């Protein structure tokens, strides 16, 4: 299996390249980690702003290897005041069988990458979600973002247990825009969100009428 | 039989030494005066009186013994050496607390004289005998302060008589009983010093800060000393040995610091220990005592350095 070291990919605009180690856990048959890049609107793109080092590379069983990503001038010519979304993928292919009617099983793990520019770079201890405003709408809730960073809400509850246990559809939202997600009415909302590395904290809010602020 | 009767001299003389510097040698004459004498040691196992009716032969051996080393009021020794031999017969130079004078000039004479063979210690007599003088030079040490001095050298000058019973009896007095004689003679001589050659430091301390042992090799530790005088001489430098050298490095005079860690001592660049420098005019010379602590035979030994280096100035 293609073991991915951490749950997200983060790369700096002032740096030229960074390394991410991969490691296969198989014991007998070798696999190859091939890497390619697609954009936001799911079209294949070999040119563009991100140039990929390893498109096809193989690793022996019980070993480890890496994937480094670097820059083209198209990353310079896009706006540096907000993030952009694109994605790099890696799949393992097993060896083919000589027999007829063979269904080959290939697996891949999908993790997103966010581009942080040097001008709006964050320090590692920064809790940047300490400024979000909450607005009561009838029938659901509207996600509004005054920051240029991405916001994905998969949870809203009256406690911690209903926020992590309750069924809620995953949605992605672009910066400085809005969209409506259906939910019930709660007095003191506790919101779930995802950080850069995969930890699970919870935020506490206080509501003043119909507009709420972070406690 | 061999009975020994001792009788020591009783003279007191004075002399003015004048103005001296430390490397020059003031000559002094030790004149002999045939004066009064006092008997101090008697032993009787034979007869006491004799009327002179038997044939009796006599012998004579003189004894003037002065120490080379002498205690002063301030505690430093005077290393005095013998300048000339003359018409003497030198024997037993291996002693360090006493030199020894002996003189045989008359032998094979039989007497017909009546006298006192075993004498009591309480008598004084008449003395008339003229012989050659002695010449004396005083070597000043390395350290001496200025001013006036009244140094007293204790010396026992005497004249004994040897009487035995058979012809061809050559017998000498043993050394362990000869040094037990009392302090009879004194000499009131005076000296004046304005100050000659003396080192200004007189401490010789070697210390510094701290660093690791990986850079302890090819080290440097120097301390200089200035020597000043006003008389043209030929000075000689000698470093006296106090400790033991751990490992053999050949002909190099190394000063041990303890625990198997010695140190090479380089006097003004040349690693020799002893040097030779002469004087030219007024001014001063210097002795830079540098030291390399390279004594490691691939084994480190942590121990506190508390050595020493005693200096002394031998003059030729």
């Amino acid at each position: 299996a293609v073991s991915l070291d951490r749950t997200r990919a983060v790369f700096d605009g002032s740096e030229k390249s960074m390394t991410l180690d991969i490691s296969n856990d198989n014991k007998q048959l070798p696999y190859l980690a091939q890497a390619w890049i697609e954009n936001e609107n799911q079209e294949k793109i070999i040119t563009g702003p991100v140039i990929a080092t390893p498109p096809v590379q193989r690793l022996e069983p019980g070993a480890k290897s890496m994937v480094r990503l670097s820059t083209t001038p198209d990353i310079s010519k896009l706006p540096q005041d907000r993030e952009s979304l694109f994605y790099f993928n890696l799949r393992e292919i097993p060896p083919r069988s000589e027999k007829a009617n063979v269904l080959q099983i290939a697996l891949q793990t999908k993790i997103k990458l966010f581009y942080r520019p040097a001008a709006i770079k964050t320090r590692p201890n920064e809790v940047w979600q300490d400024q979000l405003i909450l607005n009561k709408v009838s029938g659901g809730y509207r996600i509004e973002n005054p920051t240029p960073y991405y916001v994905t809400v998969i949870g809203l509850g009256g406690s911690e247990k209903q926020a992590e246990e309750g069924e809620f559809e995953t949605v992605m939202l672009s910066p400085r825009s809005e969209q409506t997600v259906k939910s019930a009415n709660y007095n003191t909302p506790y919101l779930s969100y995802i950080n850069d590395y995969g930890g699970r904290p919870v935020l506490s809010f206080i509501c003043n009428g119909s507009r709420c602020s972070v406690k | 039989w061999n009975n020994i009767v001792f009788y020591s001299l009783g003279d007191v003389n004075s002399y003015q030494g004048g103005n001296v510097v430390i490397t020059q040698r003031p000559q002094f004459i030790t004149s002999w005066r045939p004066g009064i004498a006092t008997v101090t040691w008697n032993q009787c196992n034979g007869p006491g009186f004799a009327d002179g009716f038997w044939a009796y032969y006599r012998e004579y051996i003189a004894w003037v013994v002065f120490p080379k080393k002498v205690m002063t009021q301030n505690g430093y020794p005077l290393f005095i050496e013998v300048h000339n031999k003359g018409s003497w017969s030198e024997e037993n130079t291996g002693d360090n607390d006493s030199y020894f004078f002996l003189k045989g000039y008359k032998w094979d004479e039989r007497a017909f004289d009546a006298g006192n063979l075993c004498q009591k210690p309480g008598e004084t007599t008449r003395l008339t005998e003229k012989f050659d003088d002695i010449i004396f030079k005083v070597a000043l040490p390395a350290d001496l302060p200025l001013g006036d001095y009244s140094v007293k050298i204790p010396y026992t000058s005497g004249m004994q008589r040897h009487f035995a019973s058979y012809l061809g009896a050559r017998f000498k007095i043993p050394y362990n009983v000869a040094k037990t004689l009392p302090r009879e003679n004194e000499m009131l001589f005076l000296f004046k010093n304005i100050g000659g050659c003396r080192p200004s430091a007189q401490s010789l301390e070697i210390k510094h800060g701290d660093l690791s042992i990986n850079s302890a090799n090819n080290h440097y530790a120097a301390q200089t000393l200035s020597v000043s005088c006003d008389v043209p001489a030929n000075i000689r430098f000698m470093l006296l040995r106090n400790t033991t050298p751990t490992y053999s490095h050949g002909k190099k005079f190394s000063v041990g610091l303890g625990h198997g860690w010695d140190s090479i001592v380089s006097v003004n660049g040349v690693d020799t220990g002893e040097t030779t420098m002469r004087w030219y005019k007024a001014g001063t010379q210097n002795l830079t005592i540098g030291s390399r602590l390279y004594g490691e035979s691939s084994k480190i030994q942590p121990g506190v350095l508390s050595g020493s280096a005693t200096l002394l100035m031998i003059l030729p």
Binding site: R6, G199, R200 | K207, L211, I213, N214
Partner: protein, 121 residues
């Protein structure tokens, strides 16, 4: 002597435990203990190693603190997790994260400072 000598520490290099990038939430019975072998150059042993630093609450005495909560880095001597070390030749110590509790974790990338006090005889 008068000289209290420092021998050496990994021939004048910087000491950094390269762990790659792994998450602080793991099972406390087997983990990614990256083995580090540090040599010390002696001139000719008479040496003991003391590691100090800030610690967290409880009765455990083998973890140095970080700049953010719910994750620490634990140290043990030699190959094998049997004997831990109380907080020419060589000495081996491995740094591995150890966790005894669940809950909220705020922060994932880290850097640590470990002070090794070398007292000579």
């Amino acid at each position: 002597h008068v000289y209290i000598p420092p021998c050496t520490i990994n021939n004048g290099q910087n000491i950094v435990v390269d762990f790659g990038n792994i998450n602080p939430e793991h099972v406390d019975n087997s983990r990614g203990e990256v083995t580090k072998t540090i040599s010390i150059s002696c001139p000719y042993g008479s040496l003991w190693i003391k590691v100090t630093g800030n610690t967290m609450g409880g009765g455990q005495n083998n973890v140095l603190a970080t700049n953010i909560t719910h994750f620490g880095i634990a140290l043990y001597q030699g190959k094998g997790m049997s004997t831990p070390l109380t907080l020419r030749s060589t000495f081996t110590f491995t740094s591995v994260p150890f966790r005894n509790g669940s809950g909220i974790l705020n922060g994932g990338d880290f850097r640590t400072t470990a002070s090794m006090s070398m007292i000579y005889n």
